[PDB]
């Protein structure tokens, strides 16, 4: 066979600054760009209207009510024939409020910042690429230290070629005076380095193919006199040995992967769509406003302070800018992954704030909590009861539960039979509990199955399907023999019901999820539905037997049972008419072939007569034979109880056969 082929793929990748922009940018009829949100304002102060350039702004994130623009007029969406996509007065985007769920916005940052994950891991990805001490790259990042030779890409007149150096005491003013206005800037950019602009630039001009060459050589040289020294030393030799492999690998991937190494330090910053951070008025909820929003404002603020500081005060020293650079970085860090560095970063009243990593992680993290399982419609719950008379394929469903689950189906019926004019008309009939609603409900559920599950669903048998039968009362009735699979008892257990809507779904339930089809357990092949408690007691009693010797007769039978029956029906009859008891011994003629399970015992007495007939008495049977060696008669000693079990098993087989026909 030729396989039917389907190819699907999912790709994950870090994104460039230009992309984050395109995710959130539009050009209006005026020709004006929209998208960056600058102000920290959320809505309005007691006005309940989104502010402009605000975290909830309509123009950047889409309209709040459909068709009603910023101005307050309403143009009918569904028609683009003569509708300004963007109104002259305001950016309207008239079509839908759904966009507020999906639309994105971006924030420009004056200072380059660094992502936490690459830096945080002990085998830091940035460090692995850098080949410089982890402390040195980090120190520059969180504390004021300045690199001296930032770019190896371009030649520079000053030549200390130093690393991060704390002291800027080196003449810097005379150097600026000697140099032209910004002549110093060209030189400084080439040489002096600060913050993370330096990291971004060092990462940006790096030679990967060269990096591999150096590494391999160093890796080859290391291992000289390897495995031949004091315990302390070898350990160190190895740790370097690996850092080297790890680094070669990262670079190789970069060569063939289309992801640019500089993207790790971030120029633009992304913003979640406004709905996903409802921040609804905390009208007594008190937590309705999102911490997402709270964290967002801080980054927005420090950034605005810096943009102004630079514009306002070129004269003010780098000390003013240096002070607030660190502040901006820290807000972003908490927003991305707080607790990575272990900083509490919490308001005193508040718990440590929720970083976006927390949102994703764990049981309540998006993937486990929402992606793997979800709440559903067309479902119900109630307590369970014994239901002995039901058949294996059936279950009893309370009527109140049913009317809820099968409502749509009944409305159709009322309309189809023309007992109601409109959908609204019918819903009324359902409420007055008129008797007709019940005849229609019964008709609709006749060949439609339903699914039942118990709470701790340990194994497949936890969910099984049944044909529902309407019952009055408020509990679900279940067949006695299905309880082992569900592990259910009748002392407070509850169950849930689901209805299968599609035709495809309905076929699967009848054909692959019904009890008759699943009578053997998955683990070794054993029967899962077998008679278990009271039922077993009854079967044992029927087959238990009768007193045999001293128990039935006081004195030896030597010094000195009777009923003989021809067909089994007569015997069962005598039991009813009280002629005999369940345990009384009896003799039954058998016309068939010696199927009685009994021990291999030779006859107790053979009695042989002169004309030729021989009678053989065994413990449970008498066989009469003649000279021609033919068995004239066989009689079995038994009790009524034994014949009753045989008859039921036999009749059931024959009945099923006669029904098929």
């Amino acid at each position: 066979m030729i396989d039917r082929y389907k190819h699907q793929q999912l790709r994950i990748g870090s994104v460039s600054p230009q992309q984050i922009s395109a995710w959130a940018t539009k050009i209006l009829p005026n020709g004006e760009i929209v998208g960056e949100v600058t102000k920290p304002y959320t809505f309005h102060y007691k006005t309940n209207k989104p502010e402009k350039d605000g975290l909830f702004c309509e123009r950047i994130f889409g309209p709040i009510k459909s068709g009603i623009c910023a101005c307050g007029n309403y143009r009918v969406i569904g028609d683009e024939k003569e509708d300004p996509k963007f109104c002259e007065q305001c950016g309207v985007e008239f079509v839908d409020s759904r966009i507020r769920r999906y639309q994105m916005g971006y924030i420009k940052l004056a200072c380059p910042v660094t992502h936490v994950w690459y830096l945080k891991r002990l085998p830091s990805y940035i460090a692995n690429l850098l080949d410089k001490p982890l402390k040195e790259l980090e120190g520059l990042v969180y504390c004021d230290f300045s690199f001296a030779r930032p770019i190896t890409k371009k030649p520079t007149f000053l030549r200390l070629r130093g690393l991060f150096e704390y002291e800027i005491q080196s003449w810097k003013y005379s150097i600026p005076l000697f140099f032209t206005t910004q002549g110093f800037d060209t030189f400084r950019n080439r040489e002096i380095s600060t913050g993370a602009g330096a990291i971004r630039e060092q990462l940006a001009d790096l030679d990967l193919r060269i990096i591999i060459e150096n590494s391999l050589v160093e890796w080859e040289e290391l291992g000289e006199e390897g495995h031949t020294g004091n315990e302390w030393e070898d350990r160190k030799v190895g740790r370097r040995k690996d850092f080297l492999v790890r680094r070669v690998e990262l670079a190789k991937h970069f060569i063939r992967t289309n992801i640019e190494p500089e993207w790790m330090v971030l120029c633009l910053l992304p913003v979640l769509p406004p709905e996903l951070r409802p921040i609804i008025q905390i009208d007594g909820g008190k937590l309705m406003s999102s911490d997402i929003n709270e964290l967002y404002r801080r980054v927005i603020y420090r950034n605005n302070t810096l943009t102004d500081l630079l514009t306002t005060s070129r004269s003010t020293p780098g000390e003013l800018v240096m002070c607030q650079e660190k502040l901006v970085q820290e807000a972003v860090d908490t927003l991305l992954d707080n607790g990575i560095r272990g900083q509490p970063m919490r308001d005193g009243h508040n718990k440590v704030y929720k970083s976006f990593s927390d949102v994703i992680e764990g049981k309540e993290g998006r993937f486990r909590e929402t992606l793997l399982g979800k709440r559903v419609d067309y479902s119900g719950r109630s307590v369970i009861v014994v239901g002995p008379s039901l058949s294996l394929h059936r279950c009893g469903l309370p009527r109140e539960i049913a009317i809820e689950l099968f409502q749509t189906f009944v409305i159709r019926g009322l309309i189809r039979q023309h007992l109601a004019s409109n959908i609204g008309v019918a819903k009324s009939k359902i409420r007055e509990k008129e008797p007709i609603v019940w005849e229609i409900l019964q008709e609709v559920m006749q060949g439609h199955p339903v699914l039942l599950n118990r709470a701790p669903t340990l194994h497949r048998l936890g969910i099984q399907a049944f044909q529902p039968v309407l019952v009055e009362g408020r509990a679900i009735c279940l067949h006695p023999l299905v309880c082992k699979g569900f592990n259910a008892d009748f002392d407070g257990d509850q169950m849930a019901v689901h209805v299968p809507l599609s035709l495809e779904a309905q076929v699967e339930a009848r054909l692959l999820m019904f009890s008759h089809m699943n009578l053997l357990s998955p683990a070794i092949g054993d029967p899962i539905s077998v008679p278990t408690q009271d039922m077993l007691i009854g079967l044992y009693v029927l087959t238990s037997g009768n007193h045999r010797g001293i128990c039935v007769n006081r004195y030896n039978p030597c010094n000195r049972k009777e009923p003989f029956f021809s067909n089994s029906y007569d015997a069962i009859g005598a039991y009813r008419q009280k002629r005999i008891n369940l345990d009384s011994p009896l003799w039954l003629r058998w016309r068939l072939d010696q199927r009685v399970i009994a021990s291999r015992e030779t006859p107790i007495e053979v009695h042989y007569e002169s004309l030729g007939t021989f009678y053989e008495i065994y413990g449970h049977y008498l066989i009469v034979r003649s000279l021609k060696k033919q068995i004239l008669f066989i009689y079995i000693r038994t009790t009524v109880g034994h014949i009753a079990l045989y008859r039921e098993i036999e009749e059931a087989i024959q009945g099923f056969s006669r029904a098929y026909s």
Partner: protein, 453 residues
């Protein structure tokens, strides 16, 4: 031809684990290898190796054809695992018309060219020798990809020599302005060598290699390196299987061999010559496996008894031991492995350089004068007078004339070593070329001739 390697593997998988009618054939394996080899996005080399392994496993049913050998060489080369590439080449050569396949009209990076360029950088010129020779039998011209370096001296013919990346001395100082005008001047394109941020390799040489060009090594450095290893293996056999040995004079000799072997990397010489490791010999190992040469089911603790258990239970058996050599039935290799290498010599180089120059000359190459100058200087380092006649002959043959001082010093060397006859021959040809012999040397040459007479 899609670009996504997987779509083809899916079709292969339907075939490999299916019924007999649909089983894979040699053409099939070859199509899947192409996808992986000619793919633009990920490492895809481990994958090729695994696929090859499957083919070898089905040896009885399937045997290789020419495209197989062709495709394989491209992959290993482009990925810079040159050692395996050479093993495969041995096969394509046996076939006729092979070179034509490897160069697929130059359509995909000129795989034939890439091989040669790599072999050289790696200093594997004995192999270059074999290859360049091979091409000839097939009448396929050396492709244009052979190219000059920033120092124009580099060319396949001259690069393997020891002085590296160094312009050759031509007497007259190279005309720097003249080179510029030639490549691009006034209008035109020159690969201006200024470093840029974008990740496209600056050497035009790197193009066509997935990650980068092979690292540069001279014939010399390579030769020392190759040498150490053979020795190391003998030492290795000594380390694990060698404390005990057949010879009864071993106790005195052991002390000597061990210290010495260590020295080699950084009498009983005959005994060392005697010692050998059988590698590539499946059979030797086979014999070894056979052995001819609480309270649960626990395998027996000694290795050799485990081997008996492995057999009884059917876990492994002798039939299972095969490799490509056994499977594809190539007999050429057995000879190569056992021999130790030949040590490096300046003279060794001279013979090889010359042989190379003619074949490239034969096949349409245009070596630069600087290249010849490279061979010339090398000849001078350890006296090799005879070469001078052929090489100067060739350079003028190539329509190139060298500066006079270099010419005279070699004539002086010949006079010093007594090769007066060679000097005269040079002057006679020099006259034919029309270049002028220095007068002072010329009178001296006549005086030397008078002395000989």
């Amino acid at each position: 031809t899609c670009g996504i390697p997987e779509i083809a593997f899916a079709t292969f998988e339907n075939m490999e684990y299916g019924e007999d009618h649909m089983k894979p054939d040699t053409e099939t394996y070859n199509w899947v290898i192409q996808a992986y080899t000619r793919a633009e996005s990920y490492d895809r080399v481990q994958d090729v190796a695994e696929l090859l392994g499957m083919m070898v496993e089905d040896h009885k049913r399937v045997q290789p054809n020419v495209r197989t050998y062709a495709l394989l060489v491209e992959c290993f080369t482009k990925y810079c695992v040159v050692r395996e590439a050479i093993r495969h080449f041995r096969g394509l050569k046996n076939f006729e018309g092979g070179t034509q396949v490897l160069y697929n009209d130059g359509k995909y990076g000129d795989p034939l060219s890439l091989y040669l360029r790599a072999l050289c950088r790696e200093g594997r010129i004995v192999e270059l020798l074999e290859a360049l020779e091979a091409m000839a039998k097939d009448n396929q011209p050396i492709p244009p990809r052979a190219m000059i370096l920033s120092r124009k001296y580099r060319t396949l013919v001259s690069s393997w020599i020891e002085p590296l990346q160094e312009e050759a001395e031509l007497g007259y100082e190279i005309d720097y302005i003249a080179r510029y005008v030639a490549e691009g001047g006034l209008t035109g394109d020159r690969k201006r060598w200024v470093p840029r941020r974008g990740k496209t390799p600056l050497d035009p040489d790197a193009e066509g290699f997935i990650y980068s060009n092979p690292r540069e090594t001279s014939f010399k450095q390579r030769c020392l390196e190759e040498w150490r290893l053979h020795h190391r293996k003998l030492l290795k056999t000594l380390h694990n299987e060698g404390p005990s040995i057949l010879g009864k004079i071993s106790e005195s000799d052991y002390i000597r061999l061990v210290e010495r072997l260590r020295k080699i990397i950084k009498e009983l010489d005959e005994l060392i010559s005697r010692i050998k490791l059988h590698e590539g010999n499946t059979e030797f190992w086979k014999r070894r496996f056979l052995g001819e040469g609480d309270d649960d089911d626990w395998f027996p603790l000694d290795i050799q008894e485990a081997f008996v258990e492995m057999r009884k239970r059917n876990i492994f058996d002798v039939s299972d031991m095969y490799t490509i050599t056994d499977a594809w039935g190539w007999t050429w290799e057995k000879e190569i492995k056992n021999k130790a290498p030949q040590r490096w010599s300046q003279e060794w180089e001279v013979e090889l350089g010359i042989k190379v120059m003619t074949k490239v000359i034969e096949l349409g190459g245009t070596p630069t004068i600087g290249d010849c100058a490279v061979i010339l200087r090398a000849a001078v380092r350890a006296p090799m007078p005879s070469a001078f006649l052929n090489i100067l002959q060739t350079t003028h043959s190539l329509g190139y004339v060298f500066g006079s001082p270099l010419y005279d010093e070699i004539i002086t060397l010949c006079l010093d070593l007594g090769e007066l006859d060679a000097a005269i021959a040079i002057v006679a040809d020099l006259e034919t070329s029309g270049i002028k012999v220095p007068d002072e040397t010329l009178d001296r040459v006549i005086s030397a001739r008078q002395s000989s007479d």
